[PDB]
Structures are given as structure tokens and as C-alpha cells.
Design a protein around this ligand. Structure first.
Ligand SMILES: O=P(O)(O)OC[C@H]1O[C@](O)(CO)[C@@H](O)[C@@H]1O
Ligand SMILES: [Mg+2]
Ligand SMILES: [Mg+2]
Ligand SMILES: [Mg+2]
Length: 328
């Protein structure tokens, strides 16, 4: 009879500092969209929700029916939250400017459904988000979203896996909240999460081996044939960034979506995939790098810009950084 919900947690966090309560409103609103997306995902084949929507988005994906439903759900709850002023979504070509009567102080970048290729085979999928405070006095605009990830005030993701989890990072750390399907509340289940200094799992799509740079090539070979005769690392690649990053957080190890000979900036999108996961990882004591610089320090120039990303346990990411340095 004492439920420690995400709302309660975010309200006491706001308690400390000076707060207007907007961030609690924003996150309460997002939790409503996440529950509605989870329920749709959990019965998607009965509700006929698998399959395509009939379009392609700005970064070239085939749009799915669940992309359109999830996107509409998040845009509508954020607008109605009275906490936001600019929204960037994977699924919209341009930033969405909230109407004056509904504006609040925050800028939200999100991936309404991550793991597209895994939808129809029932593999874990998720929602990713990053929140900034608006920086200017100027009329809100797309440029308010073009901040480096270091300016995030909150970021995280929802994982629609064997259970639904909301992982939320803010200035003093990372906490995990599980959806209780019977009462429709996110309950705190893991407090102040910290990643292990060194793991034993590497996560990359090795189908790209022909295109990898020499540093990734060398690192993968080291994980399979360690020079010190330690046990080789195990390999995991679920193929949904939210699921592979969440395993990296709770088990340690490394996740990689690097630049390659065909994709100089990688595949994943900086504003609503890479920066939120880099922020979570740094708040959990991990690292997130392109191979040459910190993901959170990149100043974006395009809301749909791509970035390479290597993240996870700091000793594993540092070992790969040392290989890039060796090869530069
Ligand atoms: O099939 P690939 O090239 O390994 O891409 C998988 C990646 O693409 C995405 O689906 C893009 O959202 C990620 O969730 C996942 O990490
Ligand atoms: Mg997509
Ligand atoms: Mg995605
Ligand atoms: Mg997506």
C-alpha cells in the first residue's frame, strides 16, 4: 500500500531544487503514451498492427503502422502536457512547434518506436527520448533542438520486452521503473543504476564486417582471440538499440554501431537515438564515443543527423578508443 511510482520519484526529485513542476507533468504525460504503446504492442497481431504504413521517413526507413500510432500518441501527450515547446521525432521531417497556449519550457527529441526490423518477429522494441530546456528568448524553433547532448536535463527509454521498463536518467543518476500492468503505474525497481567497469559481452552486427574500419576489425578479433588467453567475450545482438543498450547497462559490456566504409557517420540518429543513450550511459558511469569524440559533445547541425556510437562499460569502451588512437 505504498506505491513508489515514477511520478512520486520525479516529484521528490523536483522537490530539492527550485521547480515549476513542468518536468513531472512532461514525464507523467510520456508515461501515458508509453502505456498505450505497450498495450498496442502486446496485442499487435490481433489488432492487425503489423506491417507498413505506406511511406518512407527522412532518414530512409520504410514506415510501419506502429511507428505512426506511437508517433501520434507521443506528440499528442507532449503537446497536452503544457511542458513543451519544440518536438523532434524520427518520423517528422521538421521540428514541431507547439501552439502558444500549450507551450512549456522543454524541448523533446524522441524515437517513438525503436527496433523497426524486430516488430514483426516479436523481438523487443522501445521508445527513446531526450529532454532539453529551451535556451533562447527567441520564438521557439527547430534550432532549439540543435543542442549538444551534454545539455540534456533528462533522457531515457521505454523497453517493450518480456516486461515493459522505463529507464530514466537525470542529473544525479539512472533509475529503472517497471510497468505494473494491473494498475497502469511505473514502479521503481532498480535505484541508482551503475554499469560494471568491465563486461564480457560485445554487441555489433558483424554482417558489416566487409565495411568495418581496421580498429573495429581488430577489436572484434581480440574479443574472440584474447591475447592473454582469458575467456573470449560472448556475442549478443538483438537488433533493437533499446534492447542491446539495456542489456549493456544491466550486464555490462559494449554496444557498437560504428562508422563504416559506406556510412561515415554510422546509421543511428544523434538527437533521438545516440544522445539519449549516451546520457544514460554516462549517468550510469559508462562511456559513449564515436571512436574519436564524446557523443554528448557533438554540436548537431541537422535534427536528423547520424552519429557513430560505441557505448557501455568504461574499460571496454576505453580499450576500443585505444585501438582507434593506435590506428590514427
Ligand atoms: O540492421 P542493423 O543495420 O544492424 O540496424 C539495427 C539498428 O537499427 C535500428 O533499428 C534503428 O532504429 C536500431 O534499433 C538498431 O540498433
Ligand atoms: Mg525507423
Ligand atoms: Mg530507433
Ligand atoms: Mg523509430
Amino acid at each position: 500500500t505504498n506505491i513508489v511510482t515514477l511520478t512520486r520519484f520525479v516529484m521528490e526529485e523536483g522537490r530539492k531544487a527550485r521547480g515549476t513542476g513542468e518536468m513531472t507533468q512532461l514525464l507523467n504525460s510520456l508515461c501515458t503514451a508509453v502505456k498505450a504503446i505497450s498495450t498496442a504492442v502486446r496485442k499487435a497481431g490481433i489488432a492487425h498492427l503489423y506491417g507498413i504504413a505506406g511511406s518512407t521517413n527522412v532518414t530512409g526507413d520504410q514506415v510501419k503502422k506502429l511507428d505512426v500510432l506511437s508517433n501520434d500518441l507521443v506528440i499528442n501527450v507532449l503537446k497536452s502536457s503544457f511542458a513543451t515547446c519544440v518536438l523532434v521525432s524520427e518520423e517528422d521531417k521538421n521540428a514541431i512547434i507547439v501552439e502558444p497556449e500549450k507551450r512549456g519550457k522543454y524541448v523533446v527529441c524522441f524515437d517513438p518506436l525503436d527496433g523497426s526490423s524486430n516488430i514483426d518477429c516479436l523481438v523487443s522494441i522501445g521508445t527513446i527520448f531526450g529532454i532539453y530546456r529551451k535556451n533562447s528568448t527567441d520564438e521557439p524553433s527547430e534550432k532549439d533542438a540543435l543542442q549538444p547532448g551534454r545539455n540534456l536535463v533528462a533522457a531515457g527509454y521505454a523497453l517493450y520486452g518480456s516486461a515493459t521498463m522505463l529507464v530514466l536518467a537525470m542529473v544525479n543518476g539512472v533509475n529503472c521503473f517497471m510497468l505494473d500492468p494491473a494498475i497502469g503505474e511505473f514502479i521503481l525497481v532498480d535505484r541508482d543504476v551503475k554499469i560494471k567497469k568491465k563486461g564480457s559481452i560485445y554487441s555489433i552486427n558483424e554482417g558489416y564486417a566487409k565495411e568495418f574500419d581496421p580498429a573495429i576489425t581488430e577489436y572484434i578479433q581480440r574479443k574472440k582471440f584474447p591475447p592473454d588467453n582469458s575467456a573470449p567475450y560472448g556475442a549478443r545482438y538483438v537488433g533493437s538499440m533499446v534492447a542491446d543498450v539495456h542489456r549493456t547497462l544491466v550486464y555490462g559490456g559494449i554496444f557498437m554501431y560504428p562508422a563504416n566504409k559506406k556510412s561515415p557517420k554510422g546509421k543511428l540518429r544523434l538527437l533521438y537515438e545516440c544522445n539519449p543513450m549516451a546520457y544514460v550511459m554516462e549517468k550510469a558511469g559508462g562511456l559513449a564515443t564515436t571512436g574519436k569524440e564524446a557523443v554528448l559533445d557533438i554540436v548537431p547541425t541537422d535534427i536528423h543527423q547520424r552519429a557513430p556510437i560505441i557505448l557501455g562499460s568504461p574499460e571496454d569502451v576505453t580499450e576500443l578508443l585505444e585501438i582507434y588512437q593506435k590506428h590514427a
